[PDB]
Amino acid sequence: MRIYQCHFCSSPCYPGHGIMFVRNDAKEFRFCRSKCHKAFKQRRNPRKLKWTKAFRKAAGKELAVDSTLTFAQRRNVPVRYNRELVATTLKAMARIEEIRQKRERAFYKNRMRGNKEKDFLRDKKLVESNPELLRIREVEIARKLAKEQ
Amino acid sequence: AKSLRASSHLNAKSVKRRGVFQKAVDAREQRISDKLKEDLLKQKLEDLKKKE
Amino acid sequence: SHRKYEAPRHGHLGFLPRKRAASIRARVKAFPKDDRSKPVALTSFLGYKAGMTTIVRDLDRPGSKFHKREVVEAVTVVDTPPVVVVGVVGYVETPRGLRSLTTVWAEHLSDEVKRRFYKNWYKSKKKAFTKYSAKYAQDGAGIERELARIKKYASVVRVLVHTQIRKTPLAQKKAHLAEIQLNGGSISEKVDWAREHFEKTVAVDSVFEQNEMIDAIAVTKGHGFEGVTHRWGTKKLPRKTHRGLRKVACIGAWHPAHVMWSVARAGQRGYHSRTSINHKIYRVGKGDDEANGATSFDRTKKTITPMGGFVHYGEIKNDFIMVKGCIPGNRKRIVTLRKSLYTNTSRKALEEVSLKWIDTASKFGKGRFQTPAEKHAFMGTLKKDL
Amino acid sequence: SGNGAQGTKFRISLGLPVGAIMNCADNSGARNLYIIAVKGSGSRLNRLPAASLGDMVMATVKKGKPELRKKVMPAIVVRQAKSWRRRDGVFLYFEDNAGVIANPKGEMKGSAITGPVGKECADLWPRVASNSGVVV
Amino acid sequence: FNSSIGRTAQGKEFGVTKARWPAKSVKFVQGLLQNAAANAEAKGLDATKLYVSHIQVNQAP
Amino acid sequence: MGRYSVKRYKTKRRTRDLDLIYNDLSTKESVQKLLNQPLDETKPGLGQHYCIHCAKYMETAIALKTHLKGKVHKRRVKELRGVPYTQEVSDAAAGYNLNKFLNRVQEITQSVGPEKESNEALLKEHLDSTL
RNA sequence: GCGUUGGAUUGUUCACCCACUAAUAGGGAACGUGAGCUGGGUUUAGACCGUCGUGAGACAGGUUAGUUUUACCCUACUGAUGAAUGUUACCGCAAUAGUAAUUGAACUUAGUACGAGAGGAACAGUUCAUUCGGAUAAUUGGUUUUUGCGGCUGUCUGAUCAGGCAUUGCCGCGAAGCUACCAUCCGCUGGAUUAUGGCUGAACGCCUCUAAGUCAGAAUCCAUGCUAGAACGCGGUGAUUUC
RNA sequence: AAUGGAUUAACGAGAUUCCCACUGUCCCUAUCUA
RNA sequence: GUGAACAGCCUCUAGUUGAUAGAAUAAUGUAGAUAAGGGAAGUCGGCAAAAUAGAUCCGUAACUUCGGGAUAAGGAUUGGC
């Protein structure tokens, strides 16, 4: 079984999903789903399409180079099946993926910090440049307090 | 090709039912009634917790 | 003339009259007979069909070209809660047929099966079995006679069961009564068994196990009044034909001066009762068992319920049966699972299956992810998260 | 199956009916093939005999050497471009239709095969697989 | 007078599958029942004992 | 699915694609093969006047002069500037074979890049001298 | 019982090839089948060429152009309710009627029997396919008025925003649903016989397969199994209103 | 053989045959709207 | 206003808002569409549908009454700023 990625989508293709395409140069183009497949025929560019992962690794979004991401490459030399490798890899894959998420969430906070600065500078323009609307709300509070009275 | 209801194939199939494929059935019927006799033993011990 | 090109008939004459069935629960026509040396064992079971999924399997089949290779295939998942017993029925062989001569009920019934006897529950005084449980006084003895009568007479014994619909996400509140025959020997041993299971529930693995070839019967998928072409498979007349093109052209010859009974007219399609045999159980999971969908390979703690549940059906949290191919019927419908009717002979009835992966991606769209922890792992964090 | 084809042949999607022009994949000199009939086919009223991957069809040649044209000869289909089902969970399809030509014993006429050869066709016919440079 | 009339569920009270809700015909009939109950009060009859005993309809030109 | 997209993007009417065309420009031997094809009867310009960027044969040498001075051919020049998007770019996006990916990007930056630009410079040096 | 095809030349059946296939068997039902289709050809009026006639015109003849158009009626058939058997509800039995699966290759026996050679089989064990049928929607394709989400041209609301109209304006993706040998799954075994092979065995002091008796034996017949359930065929059980 | 015959550019809601392009006519049917 | 245009689609002045309506969305229809792979194997017969289509530049055969054939055929292109 092979969880191989979409050619266009970079999402996992579980066994039983998606179409394969084979070029006459004989390399295989496995596809996530029909949306990615019909967009491939039409000669698009996933550097340009915003929803795919090839855009997001290129356009300065979600982190691309990491020491945790080099653990799952491919192996063309088979490792002869010792069990005590297998018992640690089932503990390794639960450990690499946690450090992946603690770095990816921390990479998201570098990209979204200081929004509250621009959130508050946006509010100084709305409040201060509308003096006439702020008179209307003052009588709205006084009419609110008087109805309870 | 011989049909489904030919006399020769129904005789060859009758020999196989005397042999292996009934012993795999007769082993299955004993394993199943083991769990059915354990199913009362669970559901009486649930009744004994009401009696405490 | 002589028809000039012989061709097979369109449609099967065996499954006639094509008409709507008598009930949503399809009745069972015949059971596996009796082997009167065997232990007491139930012969059928009833549960609720819910959705489909995919299965990969390392095919261990001698002789095939897919020996020792992997094969993907589709199974059904039938929600199977435990089923509780409420009655015994005995039948006397006549020279006319079988005849029921006694039913015996069980001192206290669930509110699901007081609900079967009413069509207007909320106005009713709920008086279903009140005069019957006063006949369980000091010794009973109006029961023990009707037990002893079945022991003396009554060549075969059938046992009344019903489902537990309140344990199902299906919103219907009303259980289905059924009759199931027994196959343990010496009918005194049959009827002593069933008296020891009144008000007492039966599991599913006490009736089946893996690698078994069973058969499912139901009432299949209504479609209303359907024209001849999609009903029988008749060829379409070419284009712009007068009086239509989706029909049989010549319905009869000049003799006999009657439309015969075999010329494929239009009418009801669907909602017939059917029987499909030789369906093979792969997997019998447990309700209390967490990680039902995890095989020996996956080791990922996940249940067979796909993400966001099945489509038009909720969550599983009961016992289930995963049987390959496609059961006749649709989702949230009642199927009945008989067992095999005869000793099967092929090697396909004998194979020990070994599941390798169960799909649990969502059926409500082109689903890509298995667990909701995968989707958060792959997407990264989101705006509503922080 | 028939002559030459070792083993059995599973059900795949029928891509090429009668009268379907397909490319020629060997170095024999034919450019396109033209199917007239499919061997091992069924018989039903108003159907067309349809070919698939790894079949043997009787096929004529429309474009090629004048030594090869105007004679019916068997041919084995190696590419389909209609999506079929490998039994591991994937559908796949090729870019174009293609077929090599052979004697009824199943032995190749050319010496090489250009382009990728189908996997189900290469299992069924050994002499194709000896001349196949690329599998899948 | 009931050929080719569509069926309905509401005729189970009378045992007939074919029933219909004629609007214009009822408005004259309950116009006449309103007239007959006015005529019985003028003679000095009882209201609770009064029932329709004869009714008839036949063709006009 | 639609009407217009089926007419141009069937499996029968598929063009070459962007992957192979970057390989043809990348070396000096395959450029000289395609600029100097042997003449063939089954090809529109009788196997001459072939553009390498757009995998497309032209009828006449006049039809290369008017094709290069167009917004259609200035897509494919601007399209083939960077790394040609193999399968390896899509696998690196999921956290899978970075060192296979980053070494190829290292080679396109160092070696394959300026060999391609010194080939596309000579095509404009040649197609202006003959046209 | 089951199965008998795909094409090529004339309105054409008549007449005859090409290839596949296990095989391309023969017939009937108003030379089946126009109030099913077709009007291709059969039969008006228009027109030409050829023969005959002084002539109108007819033909030994050839070519072309060309109007019959219900069904809502009773029956038949495919489906659908339904009064009355004290009311009402649930669980059943089975009279009768229908009935379904089919053909080819492959591994092993075995390069063995058989053969001078060249060649070259069976049954048993086992795996897949060809037509046919019943369903089913995981997956993959097809479909989109979810007008769901975008995009484009023309005009219109002062511009932005958000939108109207373009007989669903058009383009891309599109869940759900419906669907396809364009997708996947499944398709049983007991009895009695026909040809024919036999045993005991006379007629006929031998002999015989038959006359009495009897053992086998066909895709055949009736059953098991599968569909409907007699709305005037039946059984078992639940409750049975005080205004 | 002005009962008119042979020839022929252009033109034709005239009659017939084929080739590329093209496509539910067809293999084989499916679906959506009024 | 778009456009070569009194074509087609949209709007201002002026004028109508009339044509039996309600509820459901079976078959078969009438009118209009889209289809994987193959591409006339359908059929008496390519009937019907699809494809081509405006404009600019290049290019254009036999044949002939020299006027035509000719938009012959076949190609490159078309937005916004």
XYZ file of C-alpha atoms (C1' of nucleotides) in Angstrom, chain G residues 49-195:
147
model
C -36.094 10.078 -73.690
C -37.256 5.315 -76.630
C -40.663 2.304 -79.550
C -45.951 2.272 -82.146
C -49.851 5.633 -84.032
C -51.913 10.524 -89.485
C -54.046 12.086 -84.361
C -55.921 12.434 -79.444
C -52.962 9.051 -76.828
C -51.313 3.882 -75.453
C -46.676 1.786 -73.900
C -41.586 -3.399 -75.172
C -40.212 0.370 -71.919
C -36.465 3.592 -68.799
C -35.607 8.313 -65.398
C -37.347 12.079 -61.898
C -41.153 14.713 -58.604
C -44.911 13.686 -55.308
C -51.251 14.458 -48.183
C -54.936 9.977 -44.832
C -54.256 12.607 -39.915
C -58.104 8.528 -34.326
C -57.865 6.413 -29.034
C -60.858 9.657 -24.036
C -64.553 4.101 -25.368
C -65.389 -2.000 -23.718
C -61.969 -6.136 -23.613
C -56.692 -7.833 -23.414
C -52.078 -6.997 -20.947
C -48.418 -4.178 -17.148
C -48.970 -1.698 -12.660
C -52.640 0.733 -8.381
C -56.593 0.960 -4.407
C -60.881 -1.384 -2.635
C -66.988 -2.426 0.070
C -68.373 -6.956 3.000
C -67.164 -12.029 6.411
C -67.875 -8.751 15.220
C -64.459 -4.339 14.948
C -58.704 -3.527 15.087
C -53.495 -4.809 15.002
C -49.220 -8.017 14.710
C -46.794 -12.826 13.430
C -47.464 -16.990 9.900
C -48.705 -21.403 6.699
C -48.910 -22.430 0.686
C -53.450 -24.167 -3.123
C -52.398 -22.449 -7.833
C -49.378 -19.651 -11.621
C -44.323 -18.492 -13.252
C -39.222 -20.154 -13.006
C -32.801 -19.512 -15.463
C -28.676 -19.690 -16.306
C -25.123 -20.530 -20.477
C -20.849 -21.594 -23.592
C -15.482 -21.251 -24.249
C -10.555 -21.448 -22.716
C -6.517 -22.106 -18.681
C -3.412 -24.771 -14.694
C -2.479 -29.619 -13.090
C -2.969 -35.661 -15.021
C 1.367 -34.958 -18.980
C 4.520 -34.276 -23.322
C 1.829 -39.499 -19.728
C -1.083 -43.316 -22.041
C -1.102 -44.128 -27.680
C 2.993 -43.821 -31.518
C 8.162 -46.164 -36.144
C 7.614 -41.036 -36.483
C 5.310 -36.284 -36.835
C 2.195 -35.718 -33.282
C -0.695 -36.095 -28.739
C -5.730 -36.940 -25.378
C -9.357 -38.018 -21.038
C -12.155 -38.260 -15.867
C -10.623 -36.444 -10.639
C -8.461 -31.565 -7.982
C -8.489 -26.095 -9.358
C -8.659 -20.740 -11.613
C -10.910 -17.169 -14.852
C -13.844 -15.569 -18.909
C -18.495 -15.304 -23.380
C -23.751 -14.196 -23.916
C -28.111 -13.828 -20.026
C -30.325 -12.332 -15.444
C -30.998 -9.956 -10.517
C -29.525 -5.968 -7.887
C -25.943 -2.132 -5.959
C -23.237 3.529 -5.718
C -17.618 2.584 -1.927
C -14.473 3.845 -5.907
C -13.909 5.825 -11.359
C -16.448 8.074 -15.177
C -21.282 10.751 -17.157
C -24.994 14.317 -15.708
C -25.959 20.329 -12.621
C -31.471 25.062 -11.482
C -27.969 23.183 -5.014
C -28.192 28.627 -10.237
C -23.146 26.237 -4.563
C -18.619 29.028 -5.591
C -15.817 31.849 -8.807
C -14.874 34.272 -14.033
C -16.214 36.898 -18.871
C -18.669 40.002 -22.762
C -23.175 43.886 -23.863
C -26.257 47.189 -21.389
C -28.611 49.368 -17.013
C -28.685 51.466 -11.266
C -23.744 58.634 -10.938
C -18.567 55.844 -9.561
C -16.997 51.893 -5.606
C -19.972 48.094 -3.274
C -23.945 44.863 -4.259
C -27.023 43.592 -8.363
C -31.077 43.362 -12.562
C -31.926 41.497 -17.950
C -29.996 38.462 -22.001
C -36.525 32.122 -23.285
C -31.297 28.374 -17.775
C -26.658 34.738 -21.171
C -21.900 32.087 -21.585
C -17.184 29.638 -19.428
C -14.375 26.638 -15.361
C -14.865 23.467 -11.061
C -19.004 21.297 -8.822
C -21.177 17.974 -3.671
C -26.101 15.282 -3.285
C -29.169 12.362 -6.369
C -29.896 9.412 -10.651
C -26.807 6.352 -13.452
C -22.970 2.646 -17.038
C -20.114 -4.915 -18.720
C -18.226 3.165 -19.347
C -18.385 0.791 -12.596
C -18.286 -3.407 -8.816
C -20.905 -7.967 -6.532
C -23.689 -12.570 -6.626
C -26.211 -16.530 -9.810
C -28.182 -24.050 -5.857
C -29.158 -30.113 -5.504
C -32.538 -34.263 -4.694
C -35.753 -37.915 -7.187
C -37.978 -40.407 -11.515
C -37.035 -41.748 -16.842
C -35.641 -41.675 -22.653
C -31.908 -43.764 -26.204
